[PDB]
Amino acid sequence: MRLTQGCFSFLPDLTDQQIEKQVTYAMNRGWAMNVEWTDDPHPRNNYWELWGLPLFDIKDPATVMFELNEARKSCAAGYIRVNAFDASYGTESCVMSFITNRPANEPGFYLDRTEGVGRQVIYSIKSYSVQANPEGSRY
Amino acid sequence: MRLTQGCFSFLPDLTDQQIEKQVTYAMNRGWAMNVEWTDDPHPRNNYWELWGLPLFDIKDPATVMFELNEARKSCAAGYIRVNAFDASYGTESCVMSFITNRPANEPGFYLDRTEGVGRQVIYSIKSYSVQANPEGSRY
Amino acid sequence: MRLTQGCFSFLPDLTDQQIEKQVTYAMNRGWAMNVEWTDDPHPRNNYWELWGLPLFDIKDPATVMFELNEARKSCAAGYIRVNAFDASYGTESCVMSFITNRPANEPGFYLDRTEGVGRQVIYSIKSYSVQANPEGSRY
Amino acid sequence: SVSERTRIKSDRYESGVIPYAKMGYWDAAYSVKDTDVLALFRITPQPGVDPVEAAAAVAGESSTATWTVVWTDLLTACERYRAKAYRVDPVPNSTDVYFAFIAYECDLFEEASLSNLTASIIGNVFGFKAISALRLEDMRIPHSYLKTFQGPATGIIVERERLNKYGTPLLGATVKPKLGLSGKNYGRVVYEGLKGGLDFLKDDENINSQPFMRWRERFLNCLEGINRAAAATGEVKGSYLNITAATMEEVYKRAEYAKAIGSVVVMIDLVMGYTAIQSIAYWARENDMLLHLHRAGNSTYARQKNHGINFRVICKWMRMSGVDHIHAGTVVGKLEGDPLMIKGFYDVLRLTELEVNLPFGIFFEMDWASLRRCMPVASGGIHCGQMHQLIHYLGDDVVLQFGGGTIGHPDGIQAGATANRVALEAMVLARNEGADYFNNQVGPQILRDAAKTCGPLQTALDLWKDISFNYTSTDTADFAE
Amino acid sequence: SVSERTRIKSDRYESGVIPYAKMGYWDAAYSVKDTDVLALFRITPQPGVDPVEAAAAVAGESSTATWTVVWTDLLTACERYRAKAYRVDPVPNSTDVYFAFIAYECDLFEEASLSNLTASIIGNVFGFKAISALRLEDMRIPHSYLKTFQGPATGIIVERERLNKYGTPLLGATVKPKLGLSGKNYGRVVYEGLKGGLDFLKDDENINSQPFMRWRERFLNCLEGINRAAAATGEVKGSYLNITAATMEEVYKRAEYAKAIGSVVVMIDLVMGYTAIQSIAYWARENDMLLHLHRAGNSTYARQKNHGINFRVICKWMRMSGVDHIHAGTVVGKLEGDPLMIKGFYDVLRLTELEVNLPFGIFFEMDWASLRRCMPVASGGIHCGQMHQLIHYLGDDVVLQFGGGTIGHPDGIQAGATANRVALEAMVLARNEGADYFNNQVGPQILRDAAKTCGPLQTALDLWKDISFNYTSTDTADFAE
Amino acid sequence: IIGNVFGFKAISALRLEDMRIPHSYLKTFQGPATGIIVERERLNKYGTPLLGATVKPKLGLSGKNYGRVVYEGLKGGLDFLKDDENINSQPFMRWRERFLNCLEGINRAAAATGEVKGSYLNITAATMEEVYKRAEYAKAIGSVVVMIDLVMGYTAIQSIAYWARENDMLLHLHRAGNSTYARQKNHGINFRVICKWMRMSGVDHIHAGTVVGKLEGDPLMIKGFYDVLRLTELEVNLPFGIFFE
């Protein structure tokens, strides 16, 4: 299946040229970019691993693309996302996050169902990749 | 094991001739029929996948049999069921659901037991096919 | 003080001619009249004593006036009121009540104050005439 | 593909947009059922919009329709749940304005829930682009839906039994100034007004809890003033203690406090909203409390004839919810009040059943299913010089409230209360004797006569004789007698 | 004779009627304080009424005045509590209509109570005879009053963090038909729509609990559909479970149930009223729940330009109360929505402060005192062929809801959801790349381009391409840019 | 309706045969907590009658052996078993032992078959407090269904019918005692009236006859009872004892 976290995952995988234009758009607004990796695709896995620090002072999109492609060479198989952070009062939060790399095959998830009280079901979303192998060897 | 959801699962697998007669019965009552597929046999998996829309405006049982055989050609190994829906006031619900296709081998389920308060057991029914493989690759 | 229960007690005491017109008014509406006496003037003394039965079948205002003046001759010093009852659906209740007789001197009431929880006061309205003498000897 | 093969291809359920009048929401031949909820809308279509299509659009978007066809209708008994516009008439003396009657199946509505009834009837259709103006004028609430509602916690009959007061309108007054008074001075005003003759006073609608007076201070001091006036008069007395607050928890706290200290009555503001109102109406029944509703905010949607909700509908909703009083107009005071519309409101609140009475704005016959009667309250810019008019327009079962008309008396609050009570009782006495009291040559004379032996009334007539509020009404009838 | 001797004989406090403009409620020289509550009214005086006297009457009867002088004013710091009309301007291109600015002392209002604020500002003045029409257009809520309110339970920022969704508008859909579906079929529709790409679905505003579907059945089935779609996509998913009910006890029961079963979000209807809304906004913060407000009934008072309450004021009151979403218009859908007014509403909901912007209807500068931002919801008669218009008018932080525009898809609910999401992401991608996407020769082309590789979108564009809702607006600006 | 008139000397026998409960009174009642439609949706069973069995012997079994019988019966194909009407809590088996063991048997059969399974846990007890305690315990351990006996009476039945809707529980009514007044033609209450009262009160199941089994049941009367319980409206049908539309 296709992991559809990220804001462009109903579109084809973005080319490097398309990614650069999105980065250019984020930096035009004064947003800080960073790169993050995980091989736990769970929807509640908030904290993907940081690829260095966010690039607060960087002004040229090419430097973001440089770090993205260094992350791609170094990280294990899995997911990479690129985020844009707006530190302005009233936001102080991420304002853009999209997937730039995904594994060749994602088995996805199943729904574990525990019998609760009455008719209630206690749900757990379980990742096939994570239950099978440790971090760094999942894909 | 044999999955005994459906209303005719203590009888042998129905022939196409037998299925057509059940379809003819439903349609003579004015019921709408549809076809659904799953490879999660859990008793609480309420929403099997729809094969198209229900056949509301269809008068010929051969048309239902046609869609059933197209579903059989296209769907992955697993389960197909045929349902009849009564939209009449006082029912507005399914009034017949039976299995038309089942995998060659269904491993079935085990009972997971968690220690609750006192002597209470927190139960979870777990499917062997689902825990081992993602949707579309379970049978 | 002047007991100002009743619906005309801010007007002078009613003459017999004035009372008769109010009775005439009530009876043209089809209301049933009755006459009641008490010498407990407490505002929560719901049930003044009945002077006979309510005059359900009576059609002449003079017959109500006759019973009123018989009550006046027979009852101890105190209060007399005349009531009009509407038994029709939606009311089934008194719709007029006024005082026709009052004592020459009414000492009235005082306010008893019991210290409650916090700043709360537990109030009791106490009648000077009632606390001094039993029924029939209060005025 | 399977989705293309199974696409619905019927006239009614193939995908796309068709007119609401072709979707089942228009039926001129529809036979109304005793269990139907009926609504009467005054519809002003946008130029070029067919009036029947607009009525069908209102019917559809207030029942089961949206703007395009959906196959999921076929999973339901869809014909049963569609509302039916069944009659569209031109409004008299208008162009491009129509009366539209719409019938709704009983099963559309959650039992006992005003919030659900209104979610359907007024939820979205007033913002519909195709309609340039829309007003809910009347509703026929069926007997079988009414019986799911409590109706008034107490009702007119039991209220008068709790007060031991029968034969005249009840009397009240809002404490003034509206804001700024301390709790101790609030209790002083209440004491003076009750001792002077009033049955009730009340908190102003915006007196809740504030820096100049926190609510417990007002409640305790008022209960000293109330019990003092009861012991001074031998009457049951009270004051509407306002329990309006930000949260339901705080409203309940104020209600319980008022009960604990023995208040006969509390008041709430309509701005608190339907769910809080229904909750406190059940509470008032369970706790032997009279429940007075001030209609704060009502005129934001009830004032204009072309758009909003006519107050007679609000009267039905609030009598269903179960308030014991509701402000309902004066005709002759400072707030809007056409007399035929007002008389209609009072009938809606007080009668056991309604007959069609188009001059009064009563468009439906409607049984009230023995839900108790709600006490109308006449308040705002009235004075005792108008007593003959108040008795004539508003009848016997009403609270006449004189705020400025009591506290504005030059000889003090007791005098002002006494002037109002003498005027009321003298007017009722003369009405019952047969006087043509509503006539301007008779009513004012009855008051002048009583004033010859009542200094306070003479003074009040002198002060306010020439005060009137003569303006053209906005909420007016469409039919004459 | 003591009452005669002590009668007040001053110009201002001798008994009698004097104009409100002579009672202290008009002061053209008044200096506004940072702590004042300010209100802007559009006033249409009755013929012959002085416009300044009408403004002073509104100011007086919404603060401390009544219709006649009362000596009890003198028991208070009366000068401090009187509101001040301080500016009356003619409305552009009208003859007898005025803009009136009125200032209210901070201490008039109970802290954190919307019911008390509205009891004063909208309580009675809309029914005043002397005014033929009255509309509350805007308010300046001071920083010091705002800090007594919670603001949004969650707010836009934390909402997107809970959903892990950043960079595009959010997506939703109302389940259809409005009424009649069973709980099991409700969960099916929710499952299909979420699996097909939507972030949310929602109960219709009139879906509460009814004979055809009791609310617990809907909640349990929807949670199965939600968790199924989350496991099928790897995304956080939800559906606005409607907890609107008759009483606060029942609302709380439905809210607690939704929380116990793990719903990320619940919805409420505005018809429930301000007190229930404030109670449940506090509850939502305390229980980690997103709180969606459907504005049921808003258009009964917000539709017409001459009378009622402008929706931008409702936006302030509901952001103060603390809902996380509020429906706020589409411009191009089936419900009323002038684009300048809509853009103003969205700014009121989303910005950290407001600047005067008369073409947008923003008459006051106003800091939002770091109350969290409220998420506008665009819903009603929209479809993916309008995506370039939605992105242009409504911006990034909004939920775009497609009910009929999802479920009306001929190839099924999943396909309808996929068409909407592809259109959204393709539009945002092109916007970010620099396209002039709002232009009718550009936006539609971006969508046609994406449709070349998305069958569902091609089908949706084919079906609804020609659908528009072009009607003249009623709620329009008074100033051009 | 039945308070005193059946004891009046002047009537030698009196039987209540039918009632027309008006629409406007019915809407004040809950009706069934769940109802036939939602029940089949909770069980995912459509197309045939449902199947059940009372555990036997009526009395004497331990909680552990009760759970064994429930396990075997469900695993063999039954949708439900049930406590006997007189199985509540007794020296030979206290009720919590039965409830815990049955839930193990139920979940075992569900995992063995892939079907929703259950057993009507009897919460009949002396006091409302104890009935609620047994209902809450059945809910807490995940039972799809509980049962009550008619001898508990109308006020407890209405209380637990509201509870069942509020707690997502199927409510099975055993009609214990009904035949003391419903058997004879000359006097008492015809069972079709009990059907109306119990459907109004809101039970989800009620015993209504077999025709061919060991308990009384004329087919015309039985068919009438089933119509009263199952139809959206009734038409006058005198052979079946239906006297009112």
Ligand SMILES: O=C(O)[C@@](O)(COP(=O)(O)O)[C@H](O)[C@H](O)COP(=O)(O)O
């Ligand atoms: O605030 C006010 O003005 C009042 O206290 C009246 O004071 P006065 O008695 O001093 O006029 C009442 O709330 C209004 O009558 C409400 O209007 P309605 O009854 O039309 O809802």
Ligand SMILES: O=C(O)[C@@](O)(COP(=O)(O)O)[C@H](O)[C@H](O)COP(=O)(O)O
């Ligand atoms: O009931 C309705 O019509 C909707 O569900 C829309 O359905 P569709 O998506 O099928 O049009 C929404 O409640 C309205 O948009 C509310 O209006 P607003 O947002 O203006 O308050």
Ligand SMILES: [Mg+2]
């Ligand atoms: Mg004592």
Ligand SMILES: [Mg+2]
């Ligand atoms: Mg007031």
Ligand SMILES: [Mg+2]
């Ligand atoms: Mg809706």
Ligand SMILES: [Mg+2]
């Ligand atoms: Mg038995």
